[PDB]
Each structure stands twice: as structure tokens, then as C-alpha cells.
Amino acid sequence: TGSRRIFSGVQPTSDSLHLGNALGAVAQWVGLQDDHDAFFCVVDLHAITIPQDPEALRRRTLITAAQYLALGIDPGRATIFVQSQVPAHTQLAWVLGCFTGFGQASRMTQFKDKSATTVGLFTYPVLQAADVLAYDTELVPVGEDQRQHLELARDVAQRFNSRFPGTLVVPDVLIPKMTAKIYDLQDPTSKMSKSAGTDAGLINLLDDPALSAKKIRSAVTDSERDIRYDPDVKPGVSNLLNIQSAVTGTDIDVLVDGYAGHGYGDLKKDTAEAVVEFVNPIQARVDELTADPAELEAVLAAGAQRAHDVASKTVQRVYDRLGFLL
Amino acid sequence: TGSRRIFSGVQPTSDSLHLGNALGAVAQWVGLQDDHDAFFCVVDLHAITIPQDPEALRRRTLITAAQYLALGIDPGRATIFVQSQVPAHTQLAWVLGCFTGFGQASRMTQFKDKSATTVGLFTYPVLQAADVLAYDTELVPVGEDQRQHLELARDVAQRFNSRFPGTLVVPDVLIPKMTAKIYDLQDPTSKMSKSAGTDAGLINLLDDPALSAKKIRSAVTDSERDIRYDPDVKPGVSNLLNIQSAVTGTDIDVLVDGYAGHGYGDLKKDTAEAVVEFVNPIQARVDELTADPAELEAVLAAGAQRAHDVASKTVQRVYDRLGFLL
Ligand SMILES: Nc1ncnc2c1ncn2[C@@H]1O[C@H](COP(=O)(O)OP(=O)(O)OP(=O)(O)O)[C@@H](O)[C@H]1O
Ligand SMILES: Nc1ncnc2c1ncn2[C@@H]1O[C@H](COP(=O)(O)OP(=O)(O)OP(=O)(O)O)[C@@H](O)[C@H]1O
Ligand SMILES: CNC1=NC(=O)[C@H]([C@H](C)c2c[nH]c3cccc(C)c23)O1
Ligand SMILES: CNC1=NC(=O)[C@H]([C@H](C)c2c[nH]c3cccc(C)c23)O1
Ligand SMILES: [Mg+2]
Ligand SMILES: [Mg+2]
């Protein structure tokens, strides 16, 4: 159909998604794609807010699409496409920036975090708003770190509609609970990110499974020697249970009860072993999709045509409302 | 041909161009269009950096195109088109913003002038750079007030080419001399602009000719009672001679010599009378083009197709260089 419209995206900024991308975003997408009209985007225009190697940016664009498919995104149910192939994104982004307070974009966390900012680092939340609003998106499945961004997208949509009623769908932010943050393994306070310097706390989907298992087995826990889920008091330990729960389907309580009398060594064992079991089918699927790119680029080609059909209607509806000559 | 490529634009922010637009920009375009490949744009995407009435924005978009034709732009020689109908502008603008220093865009005069800025008020110089660079533009005919903007366009083009040699043409800024500033008549210090509050110092092309002549006859001169061209010491008086010279074809020296023994009353007489003679053929042409819009919208339609053919090649060349999957 075209109801319960969903939109979400990941940047092709690296050679692998990490567990946070896969559990905190892409896993939700796979549940949702059955009964939602879903658009899943590789957002390459966002990638170049930071300098990118061209051969790498292209290779990583395809690899990010491939990890979508290997994680279960289904091209028969959903639409996968590359942001830069749909001009409507930047068109709407220009418009939306005209309804976006400068201070409103200054107070955005990553701009506070730096401010050698560029205009692109400053305005990318506006382009993110156009990414979502261009597809009449009803819900946006993202992790917790994307919430402030999408309240800007909602506010600008409401500011625009106040002048032009009924023009843009105001999206609901759909954020998970536990998996909403997979934490670094060497620092279970901050999120597992591609920006914490060392890959040591970072579990990449496509890394060497024995290497990821080694990082898990080396994870920072605490001293209580009690396996119990409490993210404040037990950062490392709750993260690992969160990880093991997410890649297995077992609730955390059923896990914590099965861990009565067990130690933290047993906890890392099983989590590593389940992660390895999780990533190996992914890597096999990714390897074939990289070696046989017909499938993957047909998907992207069908996705881009479908995205353009939708997104360009939105842009002309906006343009008409603004008074542009069409 | 396709050599000596020219690009320039005016915002459809009002119901009339004023003498500054017509003498400081559009008159240069008409001289240039004979031996230059020229693209002349109605830049409506810039207009909405400030709230615009939709019925007015559309009507003024066409009226600005029409004043181009009534001032002598020739659709057989040049290309006239509406900015918003060519998606490449915002596409390139997103890219260029990633190569544009935040401080570099902060130091831009109009942002200093305000800073309730929006993102659009902050980033419009970047979109202006994409407007020009998207057409492999060799020269940009503009008045003196657009110089700081186009040094940003040149710098960003050079910053981009440093990473990707040979990708973007670096445009030369082509600025006139005398007409490079037509001044307000009630304040011959500052430029005649649509933003000085009172239309009283403002000569609109399409205003009532007797009203414009009245404003001229009421112009602030000085006390020397000597007709001589010196813009510092003689602000009002040099402006009027500048105006009369520009709308007649007579050099200022030939004028000043013919004004030996004459007073300032005679100076306003002739300038008003020559302006009236200038604007009446314009208004007749504009009136027909508004009443018979077939011609005008065929021009814009041919222009937009030609602009898209050029501008989209630039964008794909840029995208390829960046490493986007095409
Ligand atoms: N540690 C994490 N836990 C859960 N979700 C995450 C995590 N990191 C990112 N996400 C989610 O992944 C999606 C895309 O994130 P993004 O592409 O910015 O990756 P990232 O890990 O933040 O990389 P980068 O440091 O390059 O920004 C969003 O829905 C975001 O909420
Ligand atoms: N007073 C002026 N004298 C000479 N050229 C001018 C003058 N004002 C604008 N121009 C030229 O007209 C072109 C477009 O100007 P623009 O569309 O910004 O008009 P404007 O008069 O500045 O109106 P606004 O106040 O809405 O910006 C540019 O090439 C600019 O240099
Ligand atoms: C640097 N650019 C950027 N950093 C982010 O955190 C967002 C994000 C990747 C993003 C861009 N477009 C989107 C559309 C829907 C959902 C999301 C998460 C996004 O963009
Ligand atoms: C608010 N926007 C804006 N204020 C300006 O002064 C420029 C200008 C109208 C502009 C936009 N695009 C252009 C391309 C070529 C030449 C010029 C003069 C322009 O834009
Ligand atoms: Mg991020
Ligand atoms: Mg201006």
C-alpha cells in the first residue's frame, strides 16, 4: 500500500555498520517493513559534511545498502535508495532552511559540540528534515541520538504548515527502548559510535568475527559479580545483556534469571558467541552482494525511481504553495 | 555558441525593477548578450529567504522576466529562466556548503547586518555560488554590491577544485563603473534599494512616469550651483548625471560641459525627462507581455529546458568527483 509510511537512513561513512546501527535502527526497520510502507535511504549527501575519499564513498554507499539487505530489509516490501540520486532532497532542504531559525539550528548539539565548522555541518539537520518530510512520512524509526534532530524536522513542518495548512505530513518519532543505545564496550557510558577513536569498543558487523568476539570478551563490566540489568549502576553489564538479548530474541529478564549464580565471564562468552552467530550470516550475504552487484544496483535503481516519483510530488506541492511558477 | 558564458540574476521581490537593477545590471547584460553565451535567471528561491505572498511571488516572477525582455534581453540570443525550475541549483548548493567555512559565511555582510536570522538568510550566498558555478560560467555581470558574494563563489570553486582539479569553472566578476551604483535620490550616499523604507528615493521602472519624474525633480543636490561630476563631494548631483548619462548614451563629460552655466533645476528637468522617455517604452512592452503571457512563458519554458541540460551535467560531474553512486 502507501499507509504507515516510514523513512529512515544511515550514512555511508564507514566500511561497516556497527551493532548500534544494526540493533538500534535496522532491526526496527525489519520488524516495521511488513505492515509499513518503508523508505530506507543511504544518505550519502550527509556523508560529505566531512571529507570523504571518492572511491571509498562509492564503495561504502553500496556496502551500506548491502548491509540493509543482509540484516533483513526486503526489496519486495521496502524501498532502498541512495539520497543523492533524488534531487527533491536538496530542493526541499533549501525551502525548509527558510523556515528554520538560525538560533534554532545553532542550538543543535553537534554544532555546539564543534563551535572550523562548515555550512554543511551547520545545515545538515535541515537536510535531514527534508529527507523525512519529502516522503509524506508518518513515522521515523531512529535511535535515541536522532531525537533532537527530528524535533526540528517536526517543528519546521509545523511552522511551514501554519503558513500553508495541510502541505507537509508531521512525522512521529519512533524510538526503541533498550536497543535505543548500544554502548561502547570500553566505555559503557557513551554510545558505540564511529567517532570514539579506537575501534576497540566498536563491534562492526563486517569485522573479523573472532576479532569482535575478542572485543566482547574484553568488555568493561563492574565488580558486583551479579548479572542484573540496571543501566545506571551496571553500565557494561547491562549493555552486554542488551546486546545478547537483541541478537537472540530472548528478553533480558529471562536472561538475567538464567544467569543467577553465573559470573561475568559466562556473560561475555555467550554474548560473544551469539554475536558471532549473528554476524556470520550477514558477512556471507554481504560478500555475495559485493561480488555480484547486479542485484544490489537493480534494487537501488528501482528504489530511486520510486523515491523520485514520491519526493518530486511533495516538492511541487510545496513549490505551488510558495507561489513559484511551475 | 557556448563561449564567454555569462550568468546573472535578479530576485522577484517586488513589482518593479528600479533604476539600479536596470542600469547597474540589466543594461550590461544587453551589451554582453551579443557576443556572450548568456543565462539570465529570475532567482525565486532567493526571494523566499524573506516571507513572500504566493500570488505575488508568482506574478512578480513573470514580471521580472518581462522587464528583462522590455530592457532588451533577446530570447533568440540569451536564455531566461526561473531558478526554482532547475533542481541542480540546490543540489550544487548542498555540495558547495560542505566546502564553505561557517566563519566564511558569517563574515558575509548581510548576516553581520542582521545578526531572527534564518538558515536561508545565512546560506543564500552559497546558493548564489551554485547559481553561477552550475553553468560553467566564465563571467558574472553584477553591480558593486554583489562583489563580496562572488568572491565567496570564486573561493569555494577554488577550494573545490583543489580537491578535484578541473571540475568547476572559476568565474570572473564583471562589474561596471559609474552605473555600478545608482543611489537613492533622497539619500545619495546609500544605494537605491527596495529596502530603504520610502519609495520616495526609488525610481521604479514600472511606476507612474509622472511620479518618477516628480521624485527626480525633488532630488537632493548640493549648494555649489555647479554641475560637475564628483561622487564624493557632489553625491546627488553626480548621481543624476550618472542617471541621465546611462539612459541616453551621452558620456558624463559631454554632459557636464553642456551644463556649464546651467543650474541644478535644469539638471533635474532633463534627467526626469530622459527617464520618462526611457521607462515609457518599457511599460508598454511589459503591459503587453503581462496581458499576453504565451510568449513569456514559452521563453521561460525553453530557458528552463536549456538550463537543465547544462546545469545537470555540472552536477553529475561534481557528484562523480565526490564519489557518489550515480
Ligand atoms: N550507538 C548507537 N545505538 C543505537 N542506535 C544508533 C547508534 N549509533 C547510531 N545509531 C542509529 O543509527 C542510525 C544512523 O546513525 P549514523 O548513520 O549517524 O551512525 P553513527 O554510528 O552515528 O555514525 P557517525 O559517527 O558517522 O555519525 C540512526 O537511527 C541512529 O539513531
Ligand atoms: N542600487 C543599485 N545600483 C546598481 N546595481 C544594483 C543596485 N541594486 C541592485 N543592483 C544589482 O541588481 C542585481 C540584483 O539585485 P537584487 O535583485 O538584489 O536587487 P536589490 O535592489 O538589491 O533588491 P533587494 O533589496 O530586494 O535585495 C545585482 O547585479 C546587483 O548588483
Ligand atoms: C551528518 N548528517 C547526519 N547526521 C545524522 O545523525 C543524520 C542522519 C544520518 C540522517 C540523515 N537523514 C536522515 C533521515 C532519516 C533518519 C536519519 C537518522 C537521518 O544526518
Ligand atoms: C537574498 N538572495 C540574494 N541576495 C543577493 O544579493 C543575491 C543575488 C540576487 C543573486 C542570487 N543568485 C545570483 C546569481 C548571479 C548573480 C546574482 C546577483 C545572484 O541573492
Ligand atoms: Mg551520527
Ligand atoms: Mg540585494
mmCIF file of all heavy atoms in Angstrom, chain A residues 11 145-146 191, ligand 5:
data_model
loop_
_atom_site.group_PDB
_atom_site.id
_atom_site.type_symbol
_atom_site.label_atom_id
_atom_site.label_comp_id
_atom_site.label_asym_id
_atom_site.label_seq_id
_atom_site.Cartn_x
_atom_site.Cartn_y
_atom_site.Cartn_z
ATOM 1 N N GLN A 11 24.276 6.858 7.189
ATOM 2 C CA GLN A 11 25.351 7.468 6.418
ATOM 3 C C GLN A 11 26.358 6.412 5.959
ATOM 4 O O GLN A 11 26.794 5.575 6.759
ATOM 5 C CB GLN A 11 26.089 8.496 7.266
ATOM 6 C CG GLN A 11 25.361 9.732 7.550
ATOM 7 C CD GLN A 11 26.179 10.652 8.411
ATOM 8 O OE1 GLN A 11 26.732 11.622 7.921
ATOM 9 N NE2 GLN A 11 26.252 10.362 9.705
ATOM 10 N N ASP A 145 19.760 9.032 19.788
ATOM 11 C CA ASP A 145 20.620 10.133 19.381
ATOM 12 C C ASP A 145 20.046 10.988 18.250
ATOM 13 O O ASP A 145 20.610 12.049 17.962
ATOM 14 C CB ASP A 145 21.981 9.555 18.988
ATOM 15 C CG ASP A 145 21.904 8.651 17.754
ATOM 16 O OD1 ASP A 145 21.075 7.710 17.750
ATOM 17 O OD2 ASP A 145 22.679 8.864 16.801
ATOM 18 N N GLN A 146 18.955 10.572 17.603
ATOM 19 C CA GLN A 146 18.407 11.331 16.483
ATOM 20 C C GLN A 146 17.160 12.128 16.850
ATOM 21 O O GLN A 146 16.665 12.892 16.024
ATOM 22 C CB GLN A 146 18.094 10.397 15.317
ATOM 23 C CG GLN A 146 19.311 9.681 14.832
ATOM 24 C CD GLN A 146 20.221 10.602 14.073
ATOM 25 O OE1 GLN A 146 19.788 11.671 13.624
ATOM 26 N NE2 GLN A 146 21.494 10.208 13.923
ATOM 27 N N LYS A 191 27.721 6.272 23.629
ATOM 28 C CA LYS A 191 27.206 5.369 22.601
ATOM 29 C C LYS A 191 28.332 4.804 21.755
ATOM 30 O O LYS A 191 29.357 5.448 21.525
ATOM 31 C CB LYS A 191 26.173 6.060 21.684
ATOM 32 C CG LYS A 191 26.740 7.227 20.822
ATOM 33 C CD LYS A 191 25.754 7.972 19.908
ATOM 34 C CE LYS A 191 25.295 7.206 18.693
ATOM 35 N NZ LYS A 191 26.421 6.995 17.696
HETATM 36 MG MG MG C 5 25.586 10.055 13.700
#
